[PDB]
């Protein structure tokens, strides 16, 4: 009744098949603010600036529109040199609230990198709407790298950009 | 005086010696603790783990020192190969609450890097920590990208430090 609308997601979204040279995550975030704020950050493709770190800046194509197989450039500086990463969105649903994406290309740490996000609501006395957001991936291991030493790169920045969320998107409630 | 202290301290660790090829910068956060509490945690050259991000884990020698001219290897956690970083400790000095180290190799995005962090009295209590650092550019490598990078990692480490520190007052 209350963790089943999360389970659901887990089993469609966030489930995944062990291929050979790849590796998988999930991650979860409480924020304390009313998920339909928290949904209007997350689902923007057009700007991941907002949520996330080390990005110098986003471009999108003049004509933009948001649709499965979308496109954008992210110019990353989470390493060096500069990184121009390609990405593509591969599902958005505004009443599920659940989008994600994948790296396309322009990005060695992260190849074949393909993501999803799924937002929750959970009220549990007072009970204020709280959320629940819900981040995994899978990706290619590179050659020659274990498999936790890639998940232990991915999950560090999904953990931050879920806490710089969790900030903007607090803040948003007391404005 | 608070104030004199800090001024003073920037003149001589926060201050640098420019230009081409070369490249630093300054920041700064401000933690609502003691300190003293704050100092502790920064000093310990042998643990940055517990307020600094993307390592993976730290090693230092069985029989460790605590003195200038100690090392620790500090594997980085990059999306790149096992990124073992050499640090040596350049100064410590627990009387005006300075510490600083350099990479002396093993980490090709920031060669020859040597950093600054003084902690600085402010009255609560409220301290502010002052971290900078003097970095390589390779000729072809935007001193842009590398001051950002550089930049962004400081920064997050210091909201770190705040969050760890400030939760030391139970």
């Not at 197989?69 to 040199?81: A, E, F, H, M, Q």
């Not at 599920?96 to 190849?111: A, D, K």
């Amino acid at each position: 009744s209350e963790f089943t609308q999360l389970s659901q997601s887990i089993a469609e979204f966030h489930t995944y098949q062990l291929g050979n040279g790849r590796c998988s995550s999930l991650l979860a975030q409480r924020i304390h603010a009313p998920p339909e704020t928290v949904w209007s950050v997350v689902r923007r493709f057009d700007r991941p600036q907002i949520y996330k770190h080390f990005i110098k800046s986003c471009n999108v194509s003049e004509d933009f529109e948001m649709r499965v197989g979308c496109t954008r450039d992210v110019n990353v500086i989470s390493g060096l040199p500069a990184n121009t990463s390609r990405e593509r969105l591969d599902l958005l649903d505004d009443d599920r609230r659940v989008t994600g994406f994948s790296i396309t290309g322009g990005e060695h740490r992260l190849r074949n990198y393909k993501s999803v996000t799924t937002v929750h609501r959970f009220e549990k006395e007072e009970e204020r709407i709280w959320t629940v957001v819900l981040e995994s991936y899978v990706v290619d291991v590179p050659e020659g790298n274990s498999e936790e030493d890639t998940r232990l790169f991915a999950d560090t920045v999904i953990r931050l950009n879920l806490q710089k969320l969790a900030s903007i998107t607090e803040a948003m409630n007391r404005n």
